[PDB]
Amino acid sequence: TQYYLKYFNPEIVYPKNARIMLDNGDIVRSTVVNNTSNPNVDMTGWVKVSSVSQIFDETYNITQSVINGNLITVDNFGAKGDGVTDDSAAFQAYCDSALTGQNLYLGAKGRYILKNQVDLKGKGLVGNGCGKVSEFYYNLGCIDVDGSSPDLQGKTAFINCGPTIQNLTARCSNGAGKQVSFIEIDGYLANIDHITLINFYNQIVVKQALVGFNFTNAWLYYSQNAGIYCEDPLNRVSTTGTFHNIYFQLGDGHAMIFDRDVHGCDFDNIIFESMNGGIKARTVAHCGFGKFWCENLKTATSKDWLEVTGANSCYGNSFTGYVKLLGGWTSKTSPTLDSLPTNNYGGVSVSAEGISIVNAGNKAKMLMLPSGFKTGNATIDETHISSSTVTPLVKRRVIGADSSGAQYLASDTYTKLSRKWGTYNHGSNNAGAFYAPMMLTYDQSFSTPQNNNGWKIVKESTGVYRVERVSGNTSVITNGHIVVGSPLMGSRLGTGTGATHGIQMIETYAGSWTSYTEAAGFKVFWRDSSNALVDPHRFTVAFTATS
Amino acid sequence: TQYYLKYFNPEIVYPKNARIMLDNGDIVRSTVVNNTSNPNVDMTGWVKVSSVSQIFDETYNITQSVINGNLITVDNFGAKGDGVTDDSAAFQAYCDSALTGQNLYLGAKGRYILKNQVDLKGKGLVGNGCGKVSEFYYNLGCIDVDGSSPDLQGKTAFINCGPTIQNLTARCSNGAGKQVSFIEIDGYLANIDHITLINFYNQIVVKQALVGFNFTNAWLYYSQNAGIYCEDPLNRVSTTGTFHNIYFQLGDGHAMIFDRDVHGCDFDNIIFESMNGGIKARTVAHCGFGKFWCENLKTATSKDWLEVTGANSCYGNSFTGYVKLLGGWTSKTSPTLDSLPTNNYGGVSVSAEGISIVNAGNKAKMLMLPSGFKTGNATIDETHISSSTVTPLVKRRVIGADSSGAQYLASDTYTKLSRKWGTYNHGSNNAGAFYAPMMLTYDQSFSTPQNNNGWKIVKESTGVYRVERVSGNTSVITNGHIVVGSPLMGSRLGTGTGATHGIQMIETYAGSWTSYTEAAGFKVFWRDSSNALVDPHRFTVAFTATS
Amino acid sequence: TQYYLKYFNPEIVYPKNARIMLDNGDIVRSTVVNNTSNPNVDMTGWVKVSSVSQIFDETYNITQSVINGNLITVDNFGAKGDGVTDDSAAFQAYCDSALTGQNLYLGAKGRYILKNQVDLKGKGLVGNGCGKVSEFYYNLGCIDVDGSSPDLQGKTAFINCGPTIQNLTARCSNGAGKQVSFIEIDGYLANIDHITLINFYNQIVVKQALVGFNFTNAWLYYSQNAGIYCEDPLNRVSTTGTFHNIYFQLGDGHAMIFDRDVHGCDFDNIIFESMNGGIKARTVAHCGFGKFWCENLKTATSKDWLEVTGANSCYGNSFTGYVKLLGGWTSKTSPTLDSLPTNNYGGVSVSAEGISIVNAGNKAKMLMLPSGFKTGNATIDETHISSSTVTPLVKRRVIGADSSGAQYLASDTYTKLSRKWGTYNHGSNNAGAFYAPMMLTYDQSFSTPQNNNGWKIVKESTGVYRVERVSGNTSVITNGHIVVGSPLMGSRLGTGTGATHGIQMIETYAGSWTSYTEAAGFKVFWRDSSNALVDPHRFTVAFTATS
């Protein structure tokens, strides 16, 4: 009478809305008229008044039950996040539930211990913060995998991850030597961002091959084998993966290991600090590499920041950010690196160190520096972009000023028949040129006549020599310059006696020279001091095929 | 007596804190003394005890009502997310509510059907996960627009979106041919990231023009017209938009369509897989393009990855990532592409294919490859960076080693008056040089005298010729080398007779040559075998203006 | 009898599950048998039935108390977010609470006023949306710092921020001239993304130095001093910071100020609109700079987009995006900028403007444009990539077509002893060449003999001259070409008389020339018209050391 408490009584008929207590003390309300059912064994016709399905938010005129569908976490399934209790069953219940969405979520605060593998069943993973690598952040929010658990030895803690890993701090405690990896995620369609992973054997285990795989803003500390590992067991070939803003620190192994081939992937703003390896792959093809900061090795003495193991399997790449190398890191991608005859890390390299380009399987490499150019094969080509164009080139070079004081660029000539360098006199307004003539020498001791460009010198008769076209030479001299050189008389060594020359042109057709200054060649006539025709043993001529 | 149930009684005075039931069975509590008001018609002086305003979390000493303000979603407004029920009214109620924040949020799990257009009223859109393109993820969390709804035909499903679209999966079901687009968002200030969009006509409809518009990490599948469409009807000109990590797959149209002009935008790590078009725009100016992976076309046979329609309207760009082309995709931006006289896709292009630079409206293009250089206009210039500097250049080239075994780079000379290539003898420690002299020919059959660089040859008298400066030529010979060539006697063809020459310098001032080896020119004297002066018809001289 | 209300009565023994009212009207339930304790003064053995610890979600069989641990915000601690009430104490309570996780969170809707500094105690900051810069978004969700509050003058509103700032809109109201800054965050390990900051003195205050610091997608408007400020008081040197997708608008000062040194940082897709300064630092070393859009200055007339104050302290950089300059912005990094002898902004610069490379402390700079090349020091070098290789180079140049119509690239020669340019006659199938010979002049008026490449000319006897090797010249002539020039007789000016020459080779060993065409040099013999030996005053020779 002085308090409220009534248990079920089988003699009573409970009207609609009547309230009594279950034997455990919880109040139930009848939802039907003439209720004679015992709510302790049969809840038909009754509801528990302390249930959120019976509590309403008047602002929305909906039950608290509905509002509790806004955000569901592992806490809903009994996870404690208390740094001690194994929450693996709660995590699994979440992933097996009909009520949960695309991703698994952690509660606001908790250090969630996992002593058994969790099958995410295709759900992604969203944590409760991306923290620094310190106990302060682990205590506020993280997944803490128990690496000492026998059931996790040699296994990955999370399998069948969906396309999301984000906003997460996750560590492995007491797993040294137990080969506990963190998470398995498929290579096709992933967004991984804002994560901090601490310890583990492999931190990110990629299944199958990359394609549309995006990875950014990750602090990956103390991995024992790799920060990111992609086996690609079926050799699908990884493509179109992006890896940005990743800090790899104090790992016993590599930053990234691809057992096989990587194509069209992008790597930028990556840090290797005290690792024992950088990025390792069998093949790296048509990938982009931006800025890398490589500082110190954990126990190794020397390591390449990028390690490609296949012969001529590093090609088509863009090494277009500066790679900082400190404390033992080396590079096979620097613009200033000398080329090899084969097995170069093929690609374009652009940084303050230089602008260069090289292919994997050839010695050719060009490098531009502030001073000019360097070549890897002792050769520099100059030609047309079009492979079909067969005109000569003209090079223009600043040599002075015109009368107004503007730069004067002079033009050269390099054809099959002419080598010249232009000039100009702005005082008198006359073009000019410097000449590299054809030179050609007759020597009666030669086994075969010397030939320059289809011309040879032959003796016609005593004292008369033809500088003549050989069979097939249809080229001509047009208004050319002619210089005859010095005679060696009497023998190849020469007696020291002299001779006087004159010339006569050889026409291509009657009147070709007289009228049009076209010639096939020319004759040289040699005479002694008595004006008699004489035969030198050897003499030179120099001539041009144009004016 | 054996249960608890009391309805309102008008004869009773209810004290403060008294509890009774409303006619519907819900308990009310009196908040005032002497309460005689019927709570069924007048709740003044009463509160409903099952309301969250009357439920407390003792940890915080606040009502559940306050806690329910932490996260509000469309579920608060009656959205079912059940794959059947039209939730459009609930979505609209959310956007019209005084209680909701910057963005619209989905509940934890739900496939939210929309059969009518939703006006976001400036709210952004945050989903419940960025999933793969599969029913598994649609069933867990997405917006599912009913493309068969007559009220959505030819319209956009969401209008007036705020500056956020994120963490979202959205599809259009049964909308083939109905031209249903997904969302309209203003071009000024946007962050779009971690989205998956499936079907629709235009997936992202940008209103007005881009500026400060950031778009990343998007899987855009099966669009019928475009993944991203920007009309820019007022021709404001789009600027400063970023488009990164986008996978366009199996669209019937283009990846991106700009009807007008795009300036200063960045595109990187984009995939076109089985599309019918890449990025199309009227003008593309000063944009950055990084890595593209273009593989296969849906029904088209050949498409450019970047399609710019305006004449000379592609200029100032950076094509600085590798563009992979497979299955019909083409490019107008490759470093190795030959230049056109006009309508080039103007910009710098850098990849393993080459390093090149070209302007839109000119044939000039330079390309650096491992082998050396290629030009698009048969010309290569060498000059100063400064347009006012008018000194000559010096080229240095490795030609051997010095006595210590270090590389010896020799210097050339190319001035208005001298062309030489330096050398050095490290055995005797003497500099040397190779010479390209001026050559100049006299021919009495010429209509006008030949002139080289302000010098011509004229007959002074029988057998005496001046190699002399013409009016305005104030340049000089300093300690030069002189070679006289071969005479053609008697006629232009030549008789074949010879002659003997000597020279005499022409001074610039009295003693200039004798004392300072400066000359204006020189005379050539020709004599026959009897030492009498004679006149050749034609002869050559070669000389240098410096030693 | 006609309502439910019973207060505590000390004469009564309350059984387990008995319910009565506290004096305030709240119902309590006995949890123990034989309960005689007054719940108004002693809650042992009682529980409040309206507490969320006594409310259950039957879907999960957990209390609402547990569900309320899923998301905790400042609203849990009494924050009103009403645009008037100071919520600083509530924010501080959140950060001091044992219940909260890594980050501080805002409620769904609220304009949260702060009139006092909040110490985040190492917690990061997560807002309720990243809005546009307008009252519409401030009213829906932001932090609104009261800049008129005396307690905030000259201070930062938030101190000791954790590694996260995201999804946030924050403004300072009425703070003009009060030097109120927004937030202090440590430089080591940060993820800042999707923020909008309005007003403040310094918006982001970085403590210590950058390392693993990632900053993206930020709209930073109206700062009075800087958008981002890093003092680095201990000169630790900032490294490995990324700054992407940042819109700086209408700031009275700079976008970013580093008082000291920055290494290995990346800046990309940044906008300066009506600022009074861009990025300022003492040292910028090995940093990457991508696309910048710089449009207009607030009150300044001219500002560099990048301002590095230290002498030769801008070096090693990559300026590899286009920098748009409008309305007064200038640049010291353009590829077309002329080099200085010192204090260049050192690095590689790549854009549609050109491809260039320069060092800080030297005049050297190379630039490639569509036309060819430009140099900053009037010099262009061509050498090997290897510093130890001492072979000559060969340049190949397109000069025509072969008989099949394919491009023919001809090879040059430039050794210590030979300068030639190759050619080929495809009509007759003969190689050819153009020659730049050594030239060397004898002059009896010279104070010392002229020397070219270890050869000089000396008089042996009347009319006999040796073109001979000097001591140490062990180089040889092999099958060379020889041309003797024109004699100046009788005096340096010349009388005009002539002479006739012949030559004789000088062997290196007996038979060297006769048998193997090897010579040390050659003799020149000069004779008058009566065939008597005579001595010219001066004469030239031209010769080659190879055929």
Author numbering:
A (entry chain A), B (entry chain B), C (entry chain C): 19 to 565
Show sentences the authors wrote.
Here we present the crystal structures of the TSP from bacteriophage ΦAB6 and its complex with cleaved EPS fragments of Ab-54149, a clinical A. baumannii strain in Taiwan. ΦAB6 was reported to belong to the Autographivirinae subfamily and to specifically recognize Ab-5414917. In the present study, the TSP from the bacteriophage ΦAB6 (ΦAB6 TSP), which specifically hydrolyzed the EPS of A. baumannii strain 54149 (Ab-54149), was characterized. The structure of the N-terminally-truncated ΦAB6 TSP determined here revealed a trimeric β-helix architecture. The structures of ΦAB6 TSP in complexes with the semi-hydrolyzed products provide deep insights into the substrate recognition and product specificity of the enzyme and also elucidate a retaining hydrolysis mechanism, for which the catalytic residues have been verified by site-directed mutagenesis.
